[PDB]
Amino acid sequence: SGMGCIT
Amino acid sequence: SGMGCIT
Amino acid sequence: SGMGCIT
Amino acid sequence: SGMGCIT
Amino acid sequence: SGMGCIT
Amino acid sequence: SGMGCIT
Amino acid sequence: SGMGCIT
Amino acid sequence: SGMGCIT
Amino acid sequence: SGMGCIT
Amino acid sequence: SGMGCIT
């Protein structure tokens, strides 16, 4: 249950 | 249950 | 149940 | 149950 | 249950 | 369940 | 379940 | 469940 | 469950 | 569950 943002 | 955004 | 966006 | 967008 | 942002 | 973009 | 874009 | 962007 | 961006 | 950005 993971989320990643490289913005 | 993962989500990834490279913006 | 994954979603990926390379924007 | 996956979805991918390369925008 | 992790989330990462490289902004 | 992989996606790659060389932009 | 892979997708690749060389843009 | 990986995604890569070389921008 | 990895993502990489070389920007 | 790793993410890398070389900006």
Author numbering:
A (entry chain A), B (entry chain A), C (entry chain A), D (entry chain A), E (entry chain A), F (entry chain A), ...: 58 to 64
Task: Provide text from the study.
This protein, like other alpha-keratin proteins, contains a central coiled-coil domain that is flanked by an amino-terminal head domain and a carboxy-terminal tail domain, which are both low complexity in sequence composition.
To assess the structural impacts of the disease-associated mutations, we determined the atomic structures of several LARKS from KRT8 for both the wild-type and mutant sequences. Segment crystal structures of KRT858–64 (wild type: SGMGGIT; G62C: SGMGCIT) for the wild-type protein and KRT8-G62C were determined. From these fibril structures, we observe that both the G62C and G55A mutations in KRT8 convert a non-pleated beta-sheet into a pleated one, transitioning a LARKS-like conformation into a steric zipper.
